[PDB]
Amino acid sequence: VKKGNAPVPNAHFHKHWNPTGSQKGHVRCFFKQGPQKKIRRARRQKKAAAVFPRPVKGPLRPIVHCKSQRFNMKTRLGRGFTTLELKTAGLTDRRYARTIGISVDRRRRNHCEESLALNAERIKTYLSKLVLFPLKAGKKLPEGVTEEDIKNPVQSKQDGFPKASSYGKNALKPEAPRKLTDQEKKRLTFQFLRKVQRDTKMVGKRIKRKAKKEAKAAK
Amino acid sequence: GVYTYMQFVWNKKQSDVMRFTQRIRAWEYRHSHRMVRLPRPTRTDKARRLGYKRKPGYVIWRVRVRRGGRKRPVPKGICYGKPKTAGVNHLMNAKNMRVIAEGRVGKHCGGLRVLNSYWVNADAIYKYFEVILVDPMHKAIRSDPEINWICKPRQKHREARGVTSAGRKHRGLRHKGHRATKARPSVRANWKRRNLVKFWRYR
Amino acid sequence: KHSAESWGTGRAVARIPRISGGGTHRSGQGAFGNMCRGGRMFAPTKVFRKWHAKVPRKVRRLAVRAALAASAIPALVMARGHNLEDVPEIPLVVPNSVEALEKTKDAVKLLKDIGAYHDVEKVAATKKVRVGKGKRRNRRYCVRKGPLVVLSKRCEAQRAFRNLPGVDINFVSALNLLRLAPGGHIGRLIVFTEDAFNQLDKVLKVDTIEGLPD
Amino acid sequence: MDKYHPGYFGKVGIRRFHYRLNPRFCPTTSISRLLRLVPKEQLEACKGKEELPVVNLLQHGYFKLLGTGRLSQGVIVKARSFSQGAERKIKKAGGACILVA
Amino acid sequence: GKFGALPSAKLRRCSAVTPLPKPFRARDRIKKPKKKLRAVRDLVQEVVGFSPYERRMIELLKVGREKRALRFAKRRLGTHRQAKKKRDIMTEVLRKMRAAAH
Amino acid sequence: GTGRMRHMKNVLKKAAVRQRQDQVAPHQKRKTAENRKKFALSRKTKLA
RNA sequence: GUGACCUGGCGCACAUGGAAUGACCCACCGAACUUAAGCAUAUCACUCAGUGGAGGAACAGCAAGCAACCUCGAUUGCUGCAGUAAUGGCGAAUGAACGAGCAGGACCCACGGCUCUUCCUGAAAAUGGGCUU
RNA sequence: GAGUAGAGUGGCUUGGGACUGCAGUUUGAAGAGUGACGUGUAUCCGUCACAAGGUGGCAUACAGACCUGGGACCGAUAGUGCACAAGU
RNA sequence: ACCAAGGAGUCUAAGGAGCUUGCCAGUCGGAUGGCUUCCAAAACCUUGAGGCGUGGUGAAGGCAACUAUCCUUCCAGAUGG
RNA sequence: GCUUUGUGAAGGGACCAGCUGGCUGGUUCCGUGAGGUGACUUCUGCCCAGUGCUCUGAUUGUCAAUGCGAAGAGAUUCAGCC
């Protein structure tokens, strides 16, 4: 079809993608990218000015490990803290947590103690970096708040905490040089891998073997 | 409670009690018209759980849909073109009879808003459904917040647009996840979104 | 936007599509063709043509570096057409006090005292109404390019030097090659201030001098 | 088609419905590219001595370790899989392979 | 390339973490038996009776033919699981009948 | 747009007035919850 | 003693609906030219045409979901996965999704991502109602 | 949350393949559980969610028509069919 | 028949083989994010997942490139001692 | 003019996407729906093997879906009858 060696076309444009006189087309041109960048920036700062004396994002999100085996080690932000993390931090009212700016996610649970401790200490450094304004402007004033934290409410751009990925990018940091352990000298890791893989394959066989053994025991 | 007992009575539909009652009701539906205004919902429990109230803003309408598949309206059964599209008789509608019934009642009562419907009866010739409609310009409706959302101009002809429960059913929206892959936000919206040729400024 | 059909053979005309209907001049006339009057062009211009161009950042930065080196070599500033009659040195460096300039009169005083107002005056004199159908599409004038003032930050010198015809403004934080080498031509007069000059290689992340053949 | 694309026109192999690729993702490195990943201060202070530096391959994005390339001094390698050649070379150099999630 | 086979972490028994025991939530009360609802349903069964296919199942279980009753329930419900459950229900109903009779 | 439009032309000119106001500046309601009372008691004292 | 309900009707009053709209949207219906160097399944295309209904957006939407992980946590849009898995006279061709990165997660919506019904309570939520003022 | 989910069968649809979804018809559950876990079935176990009711802003689309800012566009056989008393 | 004006290898997705340029076991990253009367939807920046490459082979289960002073061998062969 | 033909109405023919729909039919065998031949006159012979149509019990053969039975852990498989 080419009179050459070029690959098989595989073009995938058989269905009126082209805006001609007869067709409307299946084309979307993103010429708005440039203007929309500035527009998004402007509406983001309008969001800030609207919810001013608060984080521009606003809810504290938890840190969860990315899902699959490929992204196990990469951490990221979640949707909200588990009620166990809230109770461990000291918050037993999800609606109050939300009103003071901690995000809740009752769908999530802690499948391990590491996530629990990590997000608990996250909430605990929150609620200490946090200056609550009092309702009605002149009643009770909480601890730590010094009566000029209310005079100087500063809107930070990013939430104090490090980057979300900087929690897996710290667990992925090897130790210092060390001595070997005698089990690390005797252990055959490839033999272990092959053994634990042959294990899942020899199951029914490792039942028929027992059955034959006990039949011959009878006989 | 009373509605639980009603629900289980109506769950055992082949029982002799429910057969007797449904047979009398089928007879009187056949001797009524094709769209009748009910004075009160048959299946009080069902209408209550679908969102009926005995306030003056709600109305119940019964409607029949003739059983069977769809025959395509080609003169003398002559479908030109190719053998695939040359089928006439063994076709089946995309909508289901519940939403067809809702559509008929909503087109007949144009100034009302169609919330849920429910199967009430079925005989050899027809299936009978009851449709709950709400008068959006009634003070009770406009006052009660729980139904107040029906009075907004976006809620006109949900039966016509497939927003009701039967519509969500035949649009594939019963399931989500991997069993409603090409369903949301719409089948045609999805098709457009993944048949789109996107030309960025730099490619 | 026509219902034009071809008449076919057996009629003594060409086989182009022709306007259907009658009773007007347009009837029977050829339609649907680049060759026809009132018919579509050949390959109508589409809006999803590639308009933009992609250059790697390394190459753009190298272009900036080279444009600056050529600005430093003065046998190219004059080649591009600047008057180095009163220019004491190349590159031209200027005290940071000019970044606090508020008046175009003080900007021209500085430019005179340093020897670039000759270029500014050349541009102002040779400013003309653009030749050839560019003046119809909102590009009224053809203005030449004079000195380029590169400041260290956002300051008042922008409003100072703004009205002066040929002068352009720029900052070391973001050096525009469309200003360092306009037209693709190289060797433009740049009048860096002192801190901009001191931050040039820090911004451009230049650590060494290159060993170039001679 | 015969001359420029032989294996066209056919069907071969077990077809796998819902082919997950994240549980099959496994970038591999080699023993030749290990000692580059150790700050040579450790490589120097551990040369003849008993301590061995630790190489965490997941930090750099490698899951399996392949055993091509000679090794100069024993190091401890944490990874998600190893070839038996890689295990053999590391064990002989002195270090140890470690299976890490 | 990059997608070579790899054993799973808990098959290699690595356990980069320490698991927390899956707790009890209010949602898995939906599993526990519902005595009041079962009372309601047994009352309604007492009142309205059984479907024709349920009666045929009871009449098969009377003569024995429990496999035939299972096949009938399978044809009616589609699933072997549902068929086993319905045959269990009908066996228990028949036992209630015989007990009430004797 | 091919006829008199003897009502839609008026509603479109009204929409145009609104649009070329909002292009100048976003809208600001003259009376809101925070000034109703002040305006009303000012009016009261001024007319009394 | 000449009623009380139920179910239907006629008239009146107060109101909605109706029709329109070269862009976008929702529900249906629905081709063929074309491609396969023929052609019939396939393709064009779940498109054009046709019907109905809108809104400033519509639709979707806080899991009877993804995944099999050190799990995640509404939906939507983009990047990418990916021309891959898979479908296909396994021919012409067709062809996703999740992970992951973002925008969003202020606002004229919210019980600040839920709630109706189920379930609990319950003398209709309590000093009659109406027309003018 | 029942003529529902599911199943037999027919037809459309999908990459979804012993059938992704939908629809007719016959059938039709459990709720001392159910659905999904991409090869039909039976047997065990596990994970996730809680359908058959409803609201729900944001990021999103926008060739019309109105209000604007622009353009490496066309320049009266061009650009809209119409630069004009042109859908005349 | 004659003259004038118009009039036909174009843009796009993917790709092939040369050529140019930059970087190098990396490279690119204008999805998006930071800035600053119009110009500017530009320019600048490395927050960047990821694309391609670093490993291939098997239908798959899967497995995965010897060589401890250095160096695969042979024939032709560019330089150089 | 002749001659076949279907039809006694829940029928013949027949439209319609659909319809408790409209048509023949305001009809009822001296009526009619479907063919052929072509006034009068004189005749219209033989062939039911082929194809077509039609009748029977279609009592013997083949023959669908559903239903009923058996075996299987089940998907499923097998038999007989209408």
Q: How far is residue A22's CA from residue A96's CA, in Å, rounded to a whole number?
A: 59
* A190 interfacial to chain B (CB closer than 8 Å): no
Q: Is the dihedral of CA C175, C179, C184, C187 positive or negative?
A: negative
DSSP state letter for B104: H
Residue A169 neighbours by CB distance under 10 Å: 15
Task: Measure Cα distances from D15 to A201, D12, D23, E2 in Å.
Answer: 20, 9, 17, 20
CB-count burial class (<10 Å; 0-12, 13-18, 19+) for A89: buried
Considering CB atoms only, which of B5, B14, B16 is closest to E44? B5
Task: Measure Cα distances from E9 to A194, B37, E3 in Å.
Answer: 14, 64, 16
- Chain B nearest-CA distance from E14, in A, is 31
Mutant choice from A15, A29, A36 vs B, greatest count of B C-beta within 10 A: A29
Q: What resolution in Å is listed for this PDB structure?
A: 3.2
Considering CB atoms only, which of B4, B8, B16 is closest to E49? B16
Pair B166, B129: CB distance under 8 Å: no
Specify the pairing of strand D76-79 against strand D96-99. parallel
Partners of chain A (3+ Cβ pairs below 8 A): B, C, D, E
Pair C15, C6: CB distance under 8 Å: yes
Q: Could you check: is the Cβ of residue A48 within 7 Å of any atom of nucleic acid strand G? A: no
Scanning residues 47 through 86 of protein chain E, those with a beta carbon under 7 Å from any atom of strand H turn out to be 51-54, 75-82, 84-86
The CA-CA-CA angle for residues C158, C159, C161, to 5°, reads: 65
Reading the block at residue C201, the tokens are: 């290689």
- Residue D99's H or E segment, with its range, is strand D96-99
**Measured CA to C1', what is the nucleotide nearest C37?**
H77
Q: How far is residue C141's CA from residue C137's CA, in Å, rounded to a whole number?
A: 11
DSSP state letter for A79: S
Beta bridge partners of C141: C129
Residue the block writes with tokens 């059909």:
C5
User: Which residue numbers of C have CB closer than 8 Å to B's CBs?
Assistant: 48, 50-52, 54
Q: How far is residue B192's CA from residue B197's CA, in Å, rounded to a whole number?
A: 10
Which of B52, B54, B60 minimizes the C-alpha distance to B35? Answer: B60
Q: Could you check: is the Cβ of residue B40 within 7 Å of any atom of nucleic acid strand J? A: no
End-to-end alpha carbon distance in chain F: 53
Length of chain A: 219
Sheet arrangement for strand D96-99: D54-56, D76-79, D96-99
Please enumerate in sequence order all residues whose Cβ is within 8 A of that of E5, keeping only pairs 6 or more positions apart, or say none: D24, D26
Q: Phi, psi (5° rounding) for residue C193? A: -80, 175
Please enumerate in sequence order all residues whose Cβ is within 8 A of that of D85, keeping only pairs 6 or more positions apart, or say none: D66, D67, D68
Q: How far is residue B80's CA from residue A123's CA, in Å, rounded to a whole number?
A: 70
**Cβ contact, residue pair A72, D55, below 8 Å:** no
Q: How far is residue C45's CA from residue C66's CA, in Å, rounded to a whole number?
A: 37
Beta bridge partners of B127: B65, B122
Prior bond to B75 cis, omega within 30?
Answer: no
User: Looking at this protein, which amino acid is placed at residue A107?
Assistant: R
Task: Measure Cα distances from D39 to D54, E31, E43, E94 in Å.
Answer: 10, 57, 79, 80
Q: How far is residue B51's CA from residue B36's CA, in Å, rounded to a whole number?
A: 20
Please enumerate in sequence order all residues whose Cβ is within 8 A of that of A214, keeping only pairs 6 or more positions apart, or say none: none
* E41 interfacial to chain B (CB closer than 8 Å): yes
Q: How far is residue E28's CA from residue E37's CA, in Å, rounded to a whole number?
A: 17
Distance B191 CA to G96 C1' (A): 11
Pair A172, D59: CB distance under 8 Å: yes
Sequence-distant contacts of B107-112: CB under 8 A, at least 24 apart = B107/B160, B108/B35, B108/B61, B109/B59, B109/B61, B109/B133, B111/B135, B111/B136, B111/B137, B112/B59, B112/B136
Structure obtained using? cryo-EM
**Cβ contact, residue pair B5, E51, below 8 Å:** no
Reading the block at residue C15, the tokens are: 């086989």
DSSP state letter for C130: P
Chain A CB contacts of B196 under 8 Å are 26-28
* A183 interfacial to chain D (CB closer than 8 Å): no
* A200 interfacial to chain E (CB closer than 8 Å): yes
Residue B36, classed as helix, strand or coil, is: strand
Considering CB atoms only, which of D51, D55, D58 is closest to A178? D51
Q: How far is residue D28's CA from residue A196's CA, in Å, rounded to a whole number?
A: 21
- Could you tell me where the DSSP H helices lie in D2-100? 40-45, 57-60, 84-93
Largest CA distance in chain F: 55
Residue A69 neighbours by CB distance under 10 Å: 18
Chain B CB contacts of C54 under 8 Å are 202-203
Q: How far is residue B190's CA from residue C3's CA, in Å, rounded to a whole number?
A: 35
Q: How far is residue B104's CA from residue B101's CA, in Å, rounded to a whole number?
A: 5
Chain A CB contacts of D56 under 8 Å are 172-174
